[model samples]
Target: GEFRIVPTTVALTMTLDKLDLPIVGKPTSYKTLPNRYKDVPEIGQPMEPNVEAVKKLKPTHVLSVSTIKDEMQPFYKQLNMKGYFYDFDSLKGMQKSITQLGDQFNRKAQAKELNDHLNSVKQKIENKAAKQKKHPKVLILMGVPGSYLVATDKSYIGDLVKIAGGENVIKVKDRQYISSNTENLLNINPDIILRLPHGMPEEVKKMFQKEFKQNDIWKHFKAVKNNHVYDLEEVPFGITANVDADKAMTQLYDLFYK
Candidate 1:
């Protein structure tokens, strides 16, 4: 029996697309999805599950993240639909979700192949990172104008930083992100600071550029003084779990090792 799936997140859409699975619909917010998937019918926003749109598609499965499971479960249950909520907080969690999906769809072989490939790439990255002599103290920041948040060790990007031979300086328990200030930044004095722009508009990008350049407090940081501060380009940095691990890993390898 062929399964009809509706993926609510871009990450899940990308993953299922890789496995040659059938995605009947995707959320309307995924404007950045690959060109091939742009034509797929939109099922409204991920958080607000569109009952009418999903009902029209008659999907066998609905894929989503854990945050909205409660809101979506009852809706799917009412429709007699299977709802799968994936954890995007870590790589292992992503792998588990992939495996579960494969089991549900009887596509274990395909899922194993994909997971094996990702594992191989991860090993290669780790080997290269291990050989590096200097593991720079790295700081990962996110936000737009007037506010910044530091990524803790548990954050997805923070985990990638660890694997890429960068020492994540921010340490917090039970939290992935913490509110940040210029004083806190000066105290940590990270050797390399990666500013992760979370899908900011062009105007906000310009604003950040000007803010970082003109702020005297920011200039005093070791990363700024040494010219090690970098703004990560638009990539699958946010909401990227299983799909773009290799690409994200490669980008970090180049940034830190090269």
Candidate 2:
């Protein structure tokens, strides 16, 4: 079917941008979005889109991530628009989305070019990290202001670390995240600590600073022994997934073995 699309998330909007398709609308961003979307209409925020605004665009499809399907299904109840949810959980899943979208949207060449770029970037990281041979044991903390959870190798960020040749201290594969258990986890002594500030960053960064000293968690661990701690941005290492997989991997490659 010919498509007039409204992408409900920033990452989806950005992904559509790579496909060279004209999206009729998108969700609002807290920070500035890509330059191409400057003139596009904003339906509302990603989680709760303005049903009336989306209706105004006369879009054939409303797009969202599969992760948030539950929230979107209520659909203003009255505003039961057709929605397509893409799986944006990991790098491989993202590439498959691009490839499938190409098949459906007739954007095959554009999709191949982007995914080929991802493959090249991934290869470079594997080559570089292989030579280093010192796979840093990493601990990933996902945080807002008051809450912090540990990331397992199954999470998006954890997969990025694995591809970059880093080992996650939390090895569970069934769940993506776990509430932080600093006392027990502290004993393993990861080589580095990567803190993620999702949902709210400015406040989370300040909170983490206070926590590092108060609980002395990072201070007490090997992350602080060599002082190899870093902060990851949500844009590249997104809360769900972003098209910037290549860029995220490059950043992770350095933090991993260096």
Candidate 3:
């Protein structure tokens, strides 16, 4: 999969493992993508990648998403980099982008393999999920505290949970923002709390224990009392959209079914 072409040999650094790959010696850096929505305080923004960095790396062409802001346009153009945008809003769009990236990187064979793998796993998930008579009601919490967000059926995570034999508890909600109150959540009473993309904080874990300890409302949920709650992290989306999507799907299929 990491083969180099003959004439224009360049070392390609894939962004596939952005979530699963931890920064050396930084435990906090292991935070999931959505969890990073909580803006950390006081860290300066990362500097723009210098043009010199590209030149030194000898990259043939830079492939990027179309959603990248106009500010980055001049910088990439100035460096004579060819940028391609890939949209991931739809399943078809995601596949197209995968093919495009494969063609761009001269990895068509690898791309085909990856595509086949994703499809194969999808079929497995669908079959397994269909067999379940009662689907677990799943609520994916996106943000924390002030702005807690829920994903819709259209969102990648929502679709995935359905495929993996679970139902989005708030699927019918018009917007992803469910009413953020203890009373609302208590009323809905989601069977499972599938935390999308974050490591459990010590504070969060302690709070869970303390809250469940005192109140039957918190403790009665199937996920909480039975310990079925899972932190669905980066590997789910990253593996499928990135060069590693198929590998990621395999893990999900195995986890959900086995």
Candidate 4:
């Protein structure tokens, strides 16, 4: 049988341009990852992992994440294959997991370089955040068609916002995300609204304009009046996750400081 490897869990890498001390990661910003999926199955829930196709690759072992399907557990076990599962629940977990996976894959040297980049970017953000006297209140919105959602403090995006020197406006019980309430939105009055624009077509921008213009409740908010809304691309669940965080901070800085 042939051995196969799959990176079911994603990671983010940060680059450096300056040696800023407070932020945890690198100075410069970019995202990089291997094309591991070109060969085998990448399995998971919410997103298709294609495990059946990966099994066709005839791997000796299987690697998975917390998002793995429970039903597939017995199948891999019966095949006499080793299975490894990981959960990157925090930023620290993300760093450690990368190094661990690197060691497992016999790519320790490459992992070290990637780890260094992540550390430098984190440090830059932390240093800048430490100097801020007043942290801005930010609202990150994800509304597709009907329902609206906001990430809570436990989310990776929320972690990035806090690291980048801002406050996430959503209030939830724990680390999971929660849907946003319009009434609560009106009550909190965020300084900026970060809109995730994933899968939006060109015609959607016009729809946003029309929707915002016609909504009586939305018109009352300051972000609408002052145009303090940002349309963000790139979801934060992949290798480019940290870079997306930096881009958001840059956008906020340009809007407020410059």
lDDT of 2 by residue, 88-116 (tens): 76778778888987887789999999899
lDDT digits (tens) for residues 14-108 of candidate 4: 21111110111111112233332223233443224454655565554455444243645774565456656554444555566567756655567
The per-model lDDT (C-alpha) reads 0.76, 0.81, 0.48, 0.52
How well is each residue in 1-258 modelled by candidate 1, as lDDT tens digits?
Answer: 778888887778877877777688987762477666767899877667688888898777888876456777777776676667787666776778888878888779888888888888888999999988899999888654456677776667887888788898886746656787532765686889887765354555676688788877887787888989888764656634647888888888898866
Q: List candidate 1 segments past 4 Å from native.
A: 30-38, 47-51, 67-83, 144-147, 181-183, 201-204
Pairs clashing within candidate 2: none
Worst 10 residues of 4 by lDDT: 18-27
The model with the greatest TM-score is 2
* Model with the higher TM-score, candidate 2 or 3: 2
The list of candidate 2 runs beyond 4 A from truth reads 76-78, 181-184
RMSD list, candidates in order? 3.2, 2.2, 9.0, 7.8
Residue-wise lDDT of candidate 3 within 186-226, one digit each (tens)? 65666677654323344444554554487667566767877
Query: Order the candidates by lDDT, highest first — what do you get?
Result: 2, 1, 4, 3
* Pick by lDDT: 3 or 4, better one: 4
Candidates arranged by TM-score, highest first: 2, 1, 4, 3
TM per candidate: 0.85, 0.90, 0.57, 0.68
Evaluated at residue 152, the lDDT of candidate 1 is 75
Give per-residue lDDT, candidate 2, residue 200. 80
